Design a protein around this motif. Structure first.
Motif, short mmCIF file in Angstrom:
data_model
loop_
_atom_site.label_atom_id
_atom_site.label_comp_id
_atom_site.label_asym_id
_atom_site.label_seq_id
_atom_site.Cartn_x
_atom_site.Cartn_y
_atom_site.Cartn_z
N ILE A 24 0.92 -1.22 0.07
CA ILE A 24 0.00 -0.01 -0.16
C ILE A 24 1.05 1.20 0.14
O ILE A 24 1.49 1.48 0.96
N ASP A 25 1.01 1.87 -1.05
CA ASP A 25 1.59 3.25 -1.15
C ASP A 25 0.94 4.37 -0.82
O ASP A 25 -0.19 4.69 -1.78
N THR A 26 0.83 4.66 0.26
CA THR A 26 -0.35 5.78 0.75
C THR A 26 -0.11 7.24 -0.01
O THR A 26 -1.02 7.79 0.17
N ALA A 27 0.94 7.48 -0.78
CA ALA A 27 0.83 8.55 -1.54
C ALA A 27 -0.27 8.61 -2.52
O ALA A 27 -1.14 9.68 -2.41
N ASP A 28 -0.31 7.72 -3.62
CA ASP A 28 -1.38 7.76 -4.30
C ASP A 28 -2.60 6.60 -4.04
O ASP A 28 -3.64 6.42 -4.51
N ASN A 29 -2.48 6.03 -2.98
CA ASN A 29 -3.30 5.01 -2.04
C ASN A 29 -3.41 3.91 -3.24
O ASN A 29 -4.44 3.49 -3.45
N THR A 30 -2.49 3.79 -3.88
CA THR A 30 -2.31 2.53 -4.84
C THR A 30 -1.71 1.35 -4.33
O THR A 30 -1.18 1.30 -3.19
N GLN A 31 -2.08 0.19 -4.77
CA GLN A 31 -1.86 -0.98 -4.24
C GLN A 31 -1.15 -1.98 -5.38
O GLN A 31 -1.43 -2.00 -6.39
N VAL A 32 -0.26 -2.75 -4.76
CA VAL A 32 0.56 -4.01 -5.66
C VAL A 32 0.08 -5.39 -5.02
O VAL A 32 0.46 -5.34 -3.65
N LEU A 33 -0.86 -6.21 -5.56
CA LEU A 33 -0.96 -7.23 -4.94
C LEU A 33 -0.53 -8.68 -5.79
O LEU A 33 -0.61 -8.43 -6.83
N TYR A 34 -0.06 -9.59 -4.90
CA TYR A 34 0.37 -10.70 -5.21
C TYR A 34 -0.48 -11.96 -4.41
O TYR A 34 -0.26 -12.20 -3.19
N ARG A 35 -1.25 -12.69 -5.19
CA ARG A 35 -2.20 -13.73 -4.45
C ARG A 35 -2.78 -12.78 -3.09
O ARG A 35 -2.83 -13.19 -1.91
N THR A 183 6.87 2.33 18.33
CA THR A 183 7.97 1.96 19.03
C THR A 183 8.23 0.52 19.31
O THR A 183 9.51 0.17 19.24
N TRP A 184 7.33 -0.01 19.80
CA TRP A 184 7.60 -1.60 19.70
C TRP A 184 7.96 -2.20 18.37
O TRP A 184 8.99 -2.99 18.42
N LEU A 185 7.35 -1.68 17.46
CA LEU A 185 7.69 -2.46 16.04
C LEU A 185 8.99 -2.03 15.52
O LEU A 185 9.61 -2.80 14.93
N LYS A 186 9.44 -0.78 15.93
CA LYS A 186 10.70 -0.44 15.44
C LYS A 186 11.66 -0.86 16.09
O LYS A 186 13.01 -0.89 15.68
N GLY A 187 11.66 -1.52 17.43
CA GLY A 187 12.79 -2.29 18.01
C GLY A 187 12.66 -3.40 17.93
O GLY A 187 13.06 -4.43 18.86
N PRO A 200 16.34 -0.42 1.19
CA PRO A 200 17.31 0.47 1.16
C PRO A 200 17.86 0.76 2.88
O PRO A 200 16.82 1.03 3.52
N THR A 201 18.95 0.79 3.00
CA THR A 201 19.61 1.12 4.54
C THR A 201 18.98 2.27 4.97
O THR A 201 19.31 2.47 6.48
N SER A 202 18.77 3.28 4.37
CA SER A 202 18.48 4.64 4.86
C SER A 202 16.84 4.63 5.29
O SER A 202 16.56 5.77 5.35
N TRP A 203 16.11 3.60 5.52
CA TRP A 203 14.93 3.58 5.77
C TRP A 203 14.62 2.90 6.94
O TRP A 203 15.64 2.08 7.51
N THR A 204 13.58 3.46 7.54
CA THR A 204 13.31 3.04 8.93
C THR A 204 12.15 2.01 8.89
O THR A 204 11.21 2.25 8.00
N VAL A 205 12.21 0.86 9.65
CA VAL A 205 11.25 -0.18 9.48
C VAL A 205 10.76 -0.55 11.13
O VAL A 205 11.55 -0.83 11.78
N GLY A 206 9.46 -0.68 11.04
CA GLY A 206 8.87 -1.43 12.09
C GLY A 206 8.33 -2.61 11.49
O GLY A 206 7.63 -2.59 10.57
N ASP A 207 8.48 -3.83 12.24
CA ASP A 207 8.27 -5.04 11.36
C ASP A 207 7.76 -6.05 12.62
O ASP A 207 7.94 -5.81 13.79
N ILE A 223 6.93 1.05 6.66
CA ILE A 223 8.39 1.55 6.32
C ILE A 223 8.12 2.85 6.05
O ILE A 223 7.35 3.41 5.45
N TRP A 224 9.26 3.76 6.73
CA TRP A 224 9.35 5.18 6.36
C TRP A 224 10.56 5.50 5.45
O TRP A 224 11.58 5.49 6.18
N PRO A 225 10.38 5.83 4.28
CA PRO A 225 11.44 6.27 3.31
C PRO A 225 11.74 7.63 3.63
O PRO A 225 11.19 8.45 4.75
N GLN A 226 12.81 8.18 2.98
CA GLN A 226 13.60 9.30 3.59
C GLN A 226 12.76 10.59 2.85
O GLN A 226 13.82 11.15 1.83
N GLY A 227 11.71 11.27 2.77
CA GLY A 227 11.12 12.23 2.19
C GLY A 227 10.18 11.49 1.08
O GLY A 227 9.92 12.40 0.01
#
Length: 261
Positions: A24-35, A183-187, A200-207, A223-227
């Protein structure tokens, strides 16, 4: 068929198992789905739902996260790295929620379930926020049998992606609740070889990772990319043979293919 779905299709064929991805790309609220509507065993990815449900209850009982819960030898189950450090002692619901999400503690998960009144209490909170696909039926030590065709403890990639968005990006929870889940997911300490390895290693991820029989290898991440606008990605994977080894590499490659586009 977009180019990305040709690449994940080839990845899945290369893997020998069954791959499921929801982006889910919240920018254009588009989605890519596989199964995106196929059913997958959630395994420990279910732990996000239950922890979010305890935080919800925290929205009326202000000190619930501070409540101490006894851990007893009868409470130890199948895999309990943190809680068995506190046998004959106590953990707070805050410490139990951190344990379930960041180390995949199964006793901490079971204490979350008991606080909600059983697995139906977790499923209930799903329906409360619009998730009519999530279903949790068993407790922690058996929910990851990942039997093919078994509807127990499953959801689809499309459903889990939108739910994870509502919990961390939307307003399914109060702001102190929503920020606290972040905070929980990011750690999280279990997802180095999974989704994080294909981004990309410049991205912050909670997983949140999940695993089980039939080589089931799952990861759900925010996932939060940088900009640019954030992302929600779900990668589910399971395999034909019950004894299959885990394939965390498939999850990173799927993230890599997704981010490549």
């Amino acid at each position: 068929t977009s180019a990305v779905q040709q690449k994940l299709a080839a990845l899945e064929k290369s893997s020998g198992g069954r791959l499921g991805v929801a982006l889910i790309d919240t920018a254009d609220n588009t989605q890519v789905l596989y199964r995106g509507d196929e059913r997958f065993p959630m395994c420990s990815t279910s732990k996000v739902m239950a922890a979010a449900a305890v935080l919800k209850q925290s929205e009326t009982q202000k000190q619930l996260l501070n409540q101490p819960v006894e851990i007893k030898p009868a409470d130890l189950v199948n895999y309990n790295p943190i809680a068995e450090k506190h046998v004959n002692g106590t953990m707070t619901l805050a410490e139990l929620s951190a344990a379930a999400l960041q180390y995949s503690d199964n006793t901490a998960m079971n204490k979350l379930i008991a606080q909600l009144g059983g697995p139906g209490g977790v499923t209930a909170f799903a329906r409360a926020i619009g998730d009519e696909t999530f279903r949790l039926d068993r407790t922690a030590s058996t929910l990851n049998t990942a039997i093919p065709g078994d509807p127990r403890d499953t959801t689809t990639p499309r459903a889990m992606a939108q739910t994870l968005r509502q919990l961390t990006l939307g307003h399914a929870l109060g702001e102190t609740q929503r920020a606290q889940l972040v905070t929980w997911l990011k750690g999280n300490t279990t997802g180095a070889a999974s989704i994080r390895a294909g981004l990309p290693t410049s991205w912050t991820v909670g997983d949140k990772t999940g695993s089980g029989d039939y080589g089931t290898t799952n990861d759900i991440a925010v996932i939060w990319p940088q900009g640019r606008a954030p992302l929600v990605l779900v990668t589910y994977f399971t395999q034909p043979q019950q004894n299959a080894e885990s394939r965390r590499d498939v999850l990173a490659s799927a993230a890599r293919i997704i981010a490549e586009g």
